[PDB]
Symmetry: D2
Subunit: 299 residues, 4 copies
């Protein structure tokens, strides 16, 4: 009963670099009839499942270069499109989108597919949300691949983050393909730009895109920080898995400085892979990340 | 003419393009269709740089070049074609064609009574604009030409055919995406905002859709009829100064196309070849405007 | 012939080019001048990819292409021209000329009795190499061609004249600098080390100095005499398959020069145009090797 | 001091750096070792921008910044360190060390009697230069800092250790190659020529070889002794204005290392973060010089 738009299917008819048939779930508890799209590739009896979480303003298409590396190695991959993104349904009311709304959708998806032996792969809000999940499902998660992201700790926001919020407030709507192409350079072509704009025929479809910047916590009393501080405890003290970090250096907000701070709270995190040519959207340079992660790991 | 006007709020964040736009809505034949244009520098300047955009851009594309020209004491006129920028946008596909666009520019030129014109063009800016001086010879003095072509009715290159099929298969062209993909580090997200600004949705993009369809496949197309006469004009009648800048990272209208063009422009000096620039040469255009001016008398 | 041999210690750090070099020091006419060449793949392979470098490179330039060819079951031969790479380096200016280089390659071909050759060339690799098949038509089956030209005697374009004057004004050409400037992110500092490795000082660079001087300024030059015959061969006699890849960021031998070249190669398909590649196309050469092979009927 | 002088013909093609060099060869302690330096702008300018290069560069690195400073009515002094640029080049390994370099700069400063100094530094330029104001407090007014660090004795990051082992294992460092790899499109072949110009062969590169060897691995090192006293100075005694520009494409002294540095510079505003710039920030330095000047009260 949540008012939402479904992106017309013709928007997805030209996706040559992402040739997976999407799967759908529309009975997640609390979200009844809101349909979540997700990629599911590799053998269901694979030992390990790579759960690949996107953020703002992307979808599972972002993971198109990483997915084949994981499936070539004999693993399963699950890459959902968050509500408001990709091929998932898109609520049209501002207030529906929040930290809890997104986090719980992922928790429900995980329990719906009964995912186990999970390698969490995350970036941006993918990590902001996703890194807060294993603490409440410890037996499901075994390893972590982390890219440009952060866990909210409630500290005053850096100028770059504040500027980002004010930008998204002032503009008519965010140019989604524009933003990604500006970040990724030669790693994104016009076919990719088409794919990134595909979910959003107009601004009525971009309420989730509008809401993510507004959701960045400005005080310690936000859900993002409440969950965040518990997660930091989990990765520092409870976590006993293997991790791998890849940093896109051309990121003024969640680049090297923010990632190294994050590394300090992930117990066992080895030396990060630092990709000088990569921006915030690390997965556009993600073949070598997926290869090196796998080589580093004991599968 | 049935058309949409882009809401003004779309243009409220343009820090790199701080000109107040001018408007004309009584061009002969286009009555009530409002054309937006930049007009900067002293009206009594010796020379006027007439800067013509193509697909899928607007006068914003010239924002780096304009200050170079005005700093040197000249006037600049940079119109937004109908279907683009802040101009009105016809909603019927048949309204857009080679004559529709060419005549709009001819009318604008006569309306402002532009004289001592330095034609600056690229893409359809040139496809159209390079066909104009032959029919108004005394108004044009010099030429700055960037990645463009004059239609000659020859077989289409494979890249151009692929471009047409792309635009016919997709839902709509990702405007900011395309420019950002082409121009790399020369374009930021504020620029992407500007390029997407004219087009709240695909109903505003009928002109953007039509440009690729207009690429001529028949020697009886107006583009080629005008085109062949233009080639004669630049080769035999033109007596002005010219300067060419080539964005090398262009698979359709790059070096090969530009060198062929140079052969038909009498007096055209050695081109400036910008290895880092793509099709949208004006995003690398400060040094083009500087070198053009230094080369010119 | 008086020459210098680059000290072996210069080549001790080449992790991206882990082939043991072969040597030949009794090529007819070049007695005791030792030519280095890579030779990889089964000797009885159907086809041999003969990969010719130009100014101021060596077989290292082909390091990304070689594994693609050998992983498809073919043999690869990549010589270092005299004055370059691991080959011996004549110290007298006059020894280097079009005939000197061309004949060394002809002698190497006969010495190894190479047959079923796929000619891979660029720069002087092509300027020289594209003139060889007309005098050994039975040996050559296919062609992979990148930013190069065949001399026709026409007045030189301004860029080429500027290149000759710049070479003749400077103390010496900065070898690694030039390649790194051209190839961008496709070359790292380990690659720069490899490109500087042949040349401890300018006494080793007489061949490097001579190549720009050899660009023909009169139609009686050997480059043009052989050149015009070659043009006839590719346009009327040649009956093989070809594939052309153009590095677009090349102000001298880019798109315009390569399209002119295409007109004289009978059967040459639509070129692969690489927007991110410069003159040194082989630094972007994985995809060139892959696509060449896919385009070819390798039987 | 046994040294080589780069033959003058090496510098005959420098169209992007058309300043006539000045020389001093009687710096106290340095025998007749001749140091080259650029000195532009009016000699009586209020402020002098002292622009310090590091490994493996010279004053040429500052060619894009110098005109911005001189256009604004200021003086610029940009020395070539001994072993670099047009300066003389000791041929013995042990002559190069932290003290050797630091004292050369102190002597140059006292020789020209430089006064209202804006310290501009990067790499060893900062490693050395940032340790000088604490012993000449009255002569320094402001700071422009780019990808650099002050030695604190803490464990080396893996990338730094790898950098040292690289320089040990190779025949010699490809100087133009390294700079071109870092700066990309901001450097052309004419620039590559300028960067290789000081070094006809490895005999001229002893200072280039020695800088990586000089990186301190633990707290027992002159770099760190000076370093820890400098950190105190910038944190507690410094009262001037500062401006930081970070080249983000730097795996060693990029955003993480620069933000750590910012914490010890009292009054250091938000850094300018240049996504396209590498370690050699000055190759992207026009906008750094412009924004520094706009940020400053002079
Ligand atoms: Cl719907
Ligand atoms: Cl949808
Ligand atoms: Cl966000
Ligand atoms: Cl078009
Ligand atoms: Cl040459
Ligand atoms: Cl160092």
């Amino acid at each position: 009963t949540i008012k939402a738009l479904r992106t017309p299917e013709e928007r997805f008819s030209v996706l040559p670099a992402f040739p997976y048939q999407p799967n759908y779930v529309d009975d997640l508890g609390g979200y009844e009839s809101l349909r979540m799209a997700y990629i599911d590739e590799g053998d269901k009896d694979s030992e390990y499942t790579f759960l690949c979480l996107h953020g703002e303003p992307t979808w599972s298409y972002l993971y198109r270069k990483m997915i084949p590396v994981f499936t070539d190695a004999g693993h399963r991959v699950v890459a959902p499109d968050l509500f408001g993104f990709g091929r998932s349904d898109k609520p049209i009311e501002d207030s529906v989108y929040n930290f809890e709304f997104h986090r719980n959708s992922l928790i429900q998806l995980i329990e719906h597919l009964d995912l186990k032996n999970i390698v969490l792969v995350c970036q941006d809000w993918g990590g902001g949300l996703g890194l807060t999940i294993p603490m409440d499902m410890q037996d499901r998660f075994k390893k972590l691949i982390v890219m440009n992201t952060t866990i909210s700790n409630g500290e005053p926001l850096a100028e770059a983050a504040v500027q980002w919020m004010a930008f998204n407030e002032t503009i008519s709507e965010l140019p989604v393909a524009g933003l990604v192409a500006c970040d990724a350079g030669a790693a994104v072509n016009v076919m990719d730009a088409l794919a990134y704009d595909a979910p959003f025929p107009n601004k009525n479809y971009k309420v989730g895109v509008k809401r993510f910047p507004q959701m960045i916590p400005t005080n310690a009393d936000d859900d993002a920080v409440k969950y965040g501080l518990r997660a930091i405890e989990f990765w520092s003290n409870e976590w006993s898995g293997e991790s791998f970090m890849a940093i896109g250096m051309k990121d003024a907000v969640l680049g090297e400085a923010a990632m190294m701070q994050l590394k300090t709270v992930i117990k066992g995190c080895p030396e990060p892979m630092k990709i000088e040519e990569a921006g915030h959207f690390v997965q556009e340079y993600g073949v070598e990340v997926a290869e090196q992660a796998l080589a580093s790991f004991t599968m």
